[PDB]
C-alpha cells in the first residue's frame, strides 16, 4: 500500500506516529493539512524597503 507515516501532535516537554492511506482518486478528497506550520509575519509587520535595525533610532 502507499502508506504515509507522520508524527502525531504530542506535547513538547512531557515524556509517536499515525498512518494514512489515501483511498480516493482526487486530491480534493483527502484530509485537511492540519500540520503545516510555516510562517512569515514580515509581509504585514515590517513591510518596508530600507529594513529597520530595531537598535538604530529608525529615523534621521
Amino acid at each position: 500500500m502507499g502508506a504515509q507515516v507522520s508524527t502525531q501532535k504530542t506535547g513538547a516537554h512531557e515524556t509517536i506516529h499515525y498512518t494514512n492511506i489515501n483511498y480516493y482518486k482526487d486530491a480534493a478528497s483527502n484530509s485537511a493539512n492540519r500540520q503545516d506550520f510555516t510562517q512569515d509575519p514580515g509581509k504585514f509587520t515590517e513591510p518596508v524597503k530600507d529594513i529597520m535595525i530595531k537598535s538604530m533610532p529608525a529615523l534621521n
Binding site: 482518486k25 480534493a28 484530509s31 485537511a32 492540519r34
Partner: protein, 238 residues
Amino acid sequence: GLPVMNTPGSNQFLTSDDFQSPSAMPQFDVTPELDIPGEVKNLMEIAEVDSVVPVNNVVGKLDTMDIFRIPVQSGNHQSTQVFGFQVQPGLDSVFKHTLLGEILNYYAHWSGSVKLTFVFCGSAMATGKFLLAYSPPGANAPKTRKDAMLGTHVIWDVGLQSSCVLCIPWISQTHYRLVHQDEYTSAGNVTCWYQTGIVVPAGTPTLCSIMCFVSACNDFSVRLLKDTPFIEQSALLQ
C-alpha cells in the same frame, strides 16, 4: 482547439461513477488524523462477529427477550425437535435482522460458510447432549432425528465449554446465492434434536435455554450492492 468527439454517457449523472471534481474550498487545511480505536476497513470484519439469533420468533414474543431463548427441558422429549429454520441468512425472519443479515441485505449475492454457535444457559449441574443437523437442500426438512443425522451434524456435549459451533459449509451449485433467496439458490435447513436427554439433580431448574449466535466464516463474501428493504420513509425530515 483539439478535435474531439463526445460519446454516449456525456452529461449523465451516474450515481456510481468515479471522476475528479473541483474543490469548492481550495487549499483547505484538513484536521489532523487521530488514531481512534476500532477502524473498519471492510463490512465483512463486521459480519464475522456473532449476534444472537431470534430463533423463538413466534407470536407474542417478538418484542421480548424470550425471542432469543430456545427452550429445552428434562424428560423424554426426544420425539420432539428443539428447533429448526431455513438457512436464508438475509431473507429468513430468523436471520434478516442479525448483524450478518443486516450486512447481507445491502447486497444481492452472498457466498461462503456460516457459523452458528450454540450456548447452553442452564445450571452447571444440568447435563445434556444434542444433535445439531444442517441438511442441504433437495429434500424436505427432517421430521425425525434419524433423518437429521444423515446430514451434516455435530453431537454437542454440554460441559465446562458452554458453546458448540455448527459450521454450515458452502455446499452450493453456484458460486453465489441470492440474498433474496428463492428455490433455485436454496441453502437447506438447520434442526436440533435431543441426542441424550437433559438430566438434572434435585433442587435444580428442569427447564433451561439455549442461545444461537450467527456469524460469517472467513471465506464469506458479498456482491452487488443494493438498498435495504428495511428502512423506508413517507416524507422528509425523518
